[PDB]
Each structure stands twice: as structure tokens, then as C-alpha cells.
Write a protein that binds this ligand. Structure first.
Ligand SMILES: NC(=O)c1cccnc1
Ligand SMILES: NC(=O)c1cccnc1
Ligand SMILES: NC(=O)c1cccnc1
Ligand SMILES: NC(=O)c1cccnc1
Lengths: 477, 480
């Protein structure tokens, strides 16, 4: 959209250094490189059984169209080539005249053709999600030249999106046993991760990935990102006012006043109050009873949400048999049940008085979330009683090997002959969610391909919005 | 910095959402918020015993100066404020006039004062590396508001630089035991990580951190990133021509031909050839002897470097005693020793013929690198015989909890009184002064001394007050 960052990365050198040397290492009369992008393995995260296609549109627009147009094709040819040549002389000591860079510049666009799975659709592990190839014989080198830029910018949004989807899967499973409806699920995983992401750019694409399965986020720039590259008719994401530790302790030690003060500031909004700044169980067992009348007086769409931020994840929410105190043996959810109202649903699980709520957002991971819900189900509490603030220990603590993303070349054309290069071999076609076929030539029939032409020769050929992406994911279930 | 990328982040909403609700939550007559950025623990990575200060200068310039000048202060004001109000309107159903945003805009600069450890200096775990506060009473909320952007963009460069330092420390330690000199050390950790970083921005700052201790990198944007924000007189980074699997297999299964083809293409440069596309040990035990004559004829400055990319990291390099074949029972390094020349140095370790080299860059981690070097020294091989391609399993496989980074507010001024704020569910209180490398004092007020503070004033009221270049950073780190 209408803002801008100053950049240093040279468009024609947006790669691993060694890719500059590959053009002349290729056989003579090389014409076409065909490559595949694949989530090859989930042994490091077996709960990720579906890979959610997400991020391509943003990547195409930001880098392949805008970054190259703004900083390469728009600039003067002589300056761009002289910079490339000069770099290769200082760093490495060889004469590269950059004549291939100039030829590309004269072309005016990337002779690149990309097919990808529609965003919001999902595929099994080991199924290709993207293919790329060059469309002009002189630029065989360009396909793999772009390998570095492709997955430095795409593996994170898909891993985030696929993690979000797996969370929702677990949350729906629990709602089917403990809850009469699933109205709470779009809000049950709230993105907390921004401050712990490795950079703002990683915060936008990972946050955007979370928004494909959930409405709750604290990463405002992820909202702005989804709006700039995808768009939707309704609100992209939602959030609530919430206190932080500095706010609580700046009000001193009488937290009974601070609770009351903060609740007056947000009379008609949902409001989270971090409650462990001084003495958590004092807040829960002493001040919450004193506030009960004021709590239940607030409108239902303005519930007070209690946020612990310390102690063992399971014991705080579900309780510790190892005692000393019953409040510690019962845990937060049972304590709120004792204090405030509640009902029992058709499925037979306790639902807390909807005037009070609870959020745990302290290093939340998938197995911690799962254990907590298993804990609550065992005590007879509906899974809708807890919200999870999901942070960097979920969305930052990944690598390209979480789902095993690799962009590997699988077919080459030399002197008019196409040969498979060595998983997959040759050109690929995706038949369903969990099956694909390879060993294909460019003459074969791709009519029934799930991979959809996306970008070719500088043009975005097919555009989606975030409403379509989210609908595609509903159907995926 | 003569390029630009298109941006989506709204300057005045560039934060955790709940920070927008915090301004009206603070006590009335709040004036100054003072915060510290501290690496509190290395329990998750005990090999990181020192924190390398790195990344502040670039962050200040890119974001606190350029991004806010380009996208906020230079913009309209009515448009900038209306955008903020409308967002608050959509998302909180609350009516915020955006006056505080307008007051910021009328000010023309961030009323912000920042002290930091000079870049390249080093600090013990648990010592604050940066403090920030507001310089204008109306803008207490601004300190709070910037917490999210500060560590979304600063913990990674410091963690990468701190990892690089720990690597170099280990390599120097081994070079001291096994090697006559340590000229090999600046190239022994080569940055492979770019494709495995989570974004280009993270690749730039992590790669920059790597370049503070090492010259070898494949992350071209990390070089030009260092160029733009720091500058350097000496060489920032270097690399060599090297093949990839797609190059090898497009030539087919006759790799002996391919080797000859590739080394003919780069007769006057060092050249790495990935060697496991079809049959690794066939290339090692058959093709390398057939090429020995051709290899050793190449110039000093143009060695061939063999790149394994599969198998067990230790077994490939150091050998597997349980293995069924003699070449596998010894390592790649002993095999290269048998095939090509070698000498024994003053320290008594074998140094392979410098016409041939070896690089391992397949999921390299600090203990993996360490185990391999124990492997080679146990065999009597100098630690200089191997180069490590260090990838995303080192620089992407981190979180902010690797070094325990936390940005906490420690002092608030309310109605002209400074109060320590803290939680007791590090726990600093008040203003901090770093007395030495490994010690600081914290119960301070703004009236105290602060002479000779290791945290040195860096940015104030829109101005970068103190700037370094990449040479000073490397010099500080050498003396460290
Ligand atoms: N209470 C919150 O909204 C929050 C957001 C991000 C991180 N921690 C807490
Ligand atoms: N209870 C919640 O949905 C929620 C959302 C965001 C932050 N804290 C709590
Ligand atoms: N051999 C190399 O230069 C290299 C660079 C990046 C990743 N893998 C290998
Ligand atoms: N310095 C080296 O040996 C080397 C090997 C591979 C890639 N880059 C550098």
C-alpha cells in the first residue's frame, strides 16, 4: 500500500552468493529449469497433517512485481549492470560483465511461470504446493537463482498457517465433546507472538498465517498486511483492551482499586487484566469475591478476563493435587466456577458464568494447549472456558525443517530434450489433497491439475482475497 | 540505501494491539516511563556466555528515523490522525480523537532518549544492554508503545552476533591447540542460512550479526545491509564459486567429467563442488585420485573444496569405526589426507595439502561443530582442515528466550515523583547504570551521576548522536 521502507538488497543479487556462479556451470544449450516447492516431512511436528497454502499472492506482489519493478526494471540499465559487475569483482575476484543481467533488464519482466495451490486449500505432507520455471530459453539460470528468495519468504507464512489450522482442529475436536456450539473457536487462539518474532517482516507473514484460521490477534501489522495484499469485506481480526504488568504496578500494591479503575475505563468492552503482578491467588480468592457484584453487573459482551502469567501452565489452569491450599489444587477455572455462576450444557460439562473469563498466554505451545484442554475435560469443564494467547514459542520456534520445505529442480531441457533431475522427478501434477503424479513432460496434459497458474512474465494472473482464503479452509475441513 | 520496498505497517499502530489501550490505563499525571532491554538468561543455550551488542545503529536509522520520517512526520497529520482514530473505532468501538498522535506529529520528532552498549563491546548475561525513556512529559505512553518494535527487531541481530562470537571462541580455542596460526579462523564459519531464515529482513540482520565475527557469507543482502547502515573500510564479506545439486545432476552420472568441467570454468578461483548427488564415496576414493594431478596443478589461491551434504555429520568427517569399508571407517578428512599431501605442524597435528579442502554445511549446530573438531583432534588432525557452512539450524533456530531478552519498564514518573516499578509474581527497579562488563547498579534516579556508564547515549529527539562503522564494531570485539 502507501507506506515505504528504505532497502539495501540489490535485486539482481537477492540470492545465496553461489547462485551467481551457477549460470555457467550448467550444460551448454540449457534452456529450461523446472522446480518444485514441497513440504517434505512433518516428523518434527506430526500434528501438522495438513499444509495450508498461504503467502504466494503477497510474495508475488511484494517482491516479484513491486521490488523488481521499483528497484530493477525501473532503474537505468547501465547503473544496474555496473553495480552487479562491481560487486562480483570486490566480493569474489572475477570479471562478470553482467551481460545476462542486462538482457534480463531489456526484457522488462521476469520470464517466470509459477503454478501454486489456491490459498486456503490444504494438501497432505509430501505434496508439491508450487512449481516454477522459466519461459525464455536464455534464462534457464533464473529459476533456481530465485530459490533463496522464494523460501526465505514463503516457508514461514505456510508453517504459521498450518500450525493455526492444527490448533483449530484440536479446538473443534474438544468443542464437539465439551461444548454445545463452536462459537468460541475463532477467538480461542489469540496471536501474542509479535514481540518474539525475529523481525517485523516475519511478524507480518506469520501473523497473517494465524489470521487464516483465527480472528484474534495483537499483531496490528499483520492486520495491515492482510489488508494491503489480500483484503476482505468485513473485519480481518479482532482484539480487546488488556492491561500489562507495568500498568498494574504503576498503580501500586492495592490491586482491588486497579481492577475497579480499569473496569471503569472500559465499561462496555471485554477487558483482560493480568493478575499476577504482586499476588495472583490474592486477586483470585480475595478481590474477585469483592468485585463479584461489579463483575456480573457488566454487559455480557464486556466480560472481565483474568490473565495469569506465571506458574506451571497445567497447575494454574487445571489445579495441582500436590496441595498446601485448595485454591491451588482447584486451579483458576474451578476457582472462577466456585466464585461466579455457571451452567451445565447438554453435553454435561460446566460452563462458567459468561461475565468472567480466563486467558493463558505464557509460552503456549500446541501440546500445552492440548494438555490444558484435556485437564479441563477431566474435571468436567467445557473447553470453551479457556482462551489461549499463542505467542512466539509457537510461531517463532520453527525452521524450514518443521515441515521440510525444499525448492528442488526436477526437470531440465537441454537442446530441445527434457530430462528428469534427481522424492519427485520430472514435472508434477496434483490430483487431490493427498496425491500427485510426476515424471511428466511439458507435452503432457495438466487439465486436471490442482496447481493453478498464478504468475507469468511479470503479470499476476489470478488474484484472491482473504474472504476466499478463509472459505477455502472451511471447505478443507 | 537507494532502494525501497513497499510497506504496510502504520507508524502509529506499529505495536501489540493492547498497547493502544494502555495510554488511558496509566495513572493520571504520568510523565516519564523508563525501560531496559536485558538478556536475562542463557539457560536455554549455556554456550552463549557473552552477549555481543549489535544492531542498534541500523534499527535507529531504518525505523526510528527513516520509517517515521518517511511515513509519519512527513505525512499530512489529518490523514495520519484520522487513520488512527478510524482503526481504534473499528476495533475497540471507542472514540479516541488521536490528539496524542497529532501532538507527536506537531513535535516533528520522537521525544525519545536511548542509551546503549557500544556495538561490538560485550556484556555478561543479565546485564542491561539498552535503556529508553521519553524526553517530554506528554509522551510517557510513547516509551510503552515502542516496546514491541524494539525487540521484534533487535533480539535477533544480538543473538546471531552472540552465536557467531561463541563459534569463533571455540574455533580459536581449537586453533590454539592444534594449529600453528589462526589465519583460517575468519573463513571457518561460512553463513549458509539465508534460505532458512523466516524472512529477508531477518536474513539481513542475522547475517549482519554473523559478519561481526566472520568474513564468509552467502547472504548477499547481509553484506549490502552492513554497507548501508554501518559502512566499512576493509572487506565486509567474501565467498567462493560453488556448485549445487541441480548443477551436478543436470550433467548426469559421469561426475568425473563434471568435476573437470566445473574446475575448468573457474581456473583461478577457489571452487566448492557438492559431491553426493550420485555416489559420494565413489567421488572420494576413485575420482579424486584421477583428478589429483589436475587439482594440484591449480594455483595456491584456487583450491578445490569438497562438500559432503548427507550422512551422519560426525561419521562423514571423522569416520565411523563400526563401518564395513575402510574409507568409511576413516573420515573424509583422513581420506583426503591419504589421497593428497600433508604436513605435520609445530603442534604435532596433520595439516592436509592446501590444494584440497573440505566444507560441511548440512544442518550445522554449535555442538555439531564442536564434536567434529574433537573428532579431528582425537585423530591428530588440525582443526583448520574443515570449514563449516553454518545455516538456519544455527541462526533461525532461536527465540527471544535463547538469551532471555526482556524489555521491561523499571521506572515511572508521576506528578514529578520517580517510582520504581517491577513485578515479583531479573526484577530491575529504577534507573540502571552499567559499571562494568559484568556488573551494574539499578536503584538510581535521574539525578544520579552516570559518568563512565557503559551504556552510552545513542539517540535523542530524532538525532543519532553517536555512530559507529563496521570496523569499530570488529575492533571492539577483537579487544573483547
Ligand atoms: N494481554 C495481551 O494482549 C498480550 C499480548 C501480547 C503479549 N502478551 C500479552
Ligand atoms: N478473552 C479473549 O478473547 C482475549 C483476546 C485478546 C486478549 N486477551 C483476551
Ligand atoms: N555451497 C554453498 O555455497 C551453499 C550456500 C547456501 C546453502 N547451501 C550451500
Ligand atoms: N571458504 C570455503 O572453503 C567455502 C566453501 C564453500 C562456500 N564458501 C566458502
Amino acid at each position: 500500500l502507501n507506506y515505504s521502507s528504505r532497502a539495501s538488497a540489490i535485486p539482481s543479487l537477492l540470492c545465496d552468493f553461489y547462485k551467481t556462479s551457477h549460470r555457467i556451470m550448467y550444460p551448454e544449450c540449457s534452456q529450461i529449469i523446472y522446480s518444485t516447492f514441497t513440504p517434505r516431512s512433518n516428523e518434527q511436528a506430526p500434528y501438522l497433517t495438513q499444509v495450508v497454502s498461504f503467502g504466494f499472492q503477497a510474495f508475488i506482489i511484494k517482491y516479484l512485481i513491486h521490488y523488481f519493478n521499483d528497484n530493477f526494471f525501473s532503474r537505468d540499465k547501465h547503473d544496474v549492470v555496473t553495480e552487479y559487475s562491481a560487486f562480483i569483482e570486490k566480493t569474489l575476484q572475477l570479471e562478470d560483465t553482467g551481460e545476462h543481467i542486462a538482457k534480463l533488464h531489456e526484457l522488462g519482466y521476469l520470464p517466470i511461470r509459477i503454478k501454486a495451490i489456491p490459498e486456503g486449500k490444504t494438501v497432505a505432507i509430501k505434496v508439491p504446493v508450487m512449481t516454477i520455471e522459466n519461459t525464455h530459453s536464455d534464462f534457464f539460470w533464473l529459476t533456481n537463482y530465485l530459490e533463496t528468495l522464494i523460501n526465505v519468504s514463503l516457508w514461514q507464512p505456510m508453517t504459521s498457517a498450518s500450525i493455526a489450522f492444527a490448533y483449530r482442529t484440536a479446538l473443534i475436536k474438544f468443542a464437539n465433546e465439551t461444548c454445545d456450539n463452536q462459537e468460541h473457536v475463532p477467538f480461542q487462539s489469540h496471536d501474542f507472538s509479535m514481540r518474539g518474532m525475529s523481525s517485523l517482516e516475519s511478524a507480518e507473514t506469520s501473523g497473517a498465517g494465524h489470521l487464516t484460521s483465527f480472528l484474534g490477534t495483537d499483531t496490528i501489522p499483520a492486520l495491515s498486511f492482510v489488508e494491503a495484499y489480500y483484503g476482505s469485506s468485513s473485519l480481518i481480526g479482532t482484539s480487546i483492551p488488556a492491561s500489562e504488568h507495568s500498568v498494574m504496578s504503576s498503580h501500586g500494591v492495592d490491586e482491588l482499586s486497579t481492577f475497579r479503575y480499569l473496569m471503569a475505563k472500559f465499561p462496555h468492552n471485554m477487558l483482560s487484566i493480568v493478575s499476577d503482578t504482586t499476588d495472583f491467588w490474592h486477586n483470585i480468592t480475595v478481590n474477585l469475591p469483592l468485585l463479584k457484584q461489579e463483575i456480573i453487573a457488566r454487559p455480557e459482551n464486556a466480560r472481565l478476563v483474568i490473565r495469569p502469567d506465571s506458574g506451571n501452565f497445567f497447575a494454574i489452569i487445571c489445579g495441582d493435587p500436590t496441595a498446601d491450599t485448595e485454591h491451588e489444587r482447584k486451579g483458576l477455572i474451578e476457582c472462577l466456577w466456585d466464585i461466579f455462576g455457571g451452567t451445565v450444557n447438554q453435553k454435561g460439562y460446566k460452563v462458567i458464568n459468561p461475565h468472567i473469563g480466563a486467558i493463558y498466554g505464557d509460552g503456549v505451545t500446541y501440546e500445552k494447549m492440548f494438555k490444558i484442554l484435556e485437564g479441563l475435560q477431566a474435571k468436567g469443564f467445557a473447553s470453551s472456558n479457556i482462551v489461549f494467547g499463542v505467542g512466539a514459542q509457537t510461531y517463532q520456534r520453527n525452521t524450514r525443517d518443521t515441515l521440510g520445505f525444499a525448492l528442488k529442480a526436477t526437470s531440465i531441457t537441454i537442446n530441445g530434450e527434457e530430462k528428469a533431475i534427481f522424492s519427485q522427478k520430472g514435472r508434477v501434477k496434483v490430483l487431490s489433497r493427498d496425491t500427485y503424479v510426476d515424471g511428466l513432460t511439458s507435452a503432457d496434459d495438466f487439465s486436471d491439475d490442482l496447481l493453478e497458474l498464478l504468475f507469468e512474465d511479470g503479470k499476476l494472473l489470478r488474484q484472491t482475497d482473504f474472504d476466499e482464503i478463509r472459505q477455502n479452509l472451511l471447505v478443507s475441513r
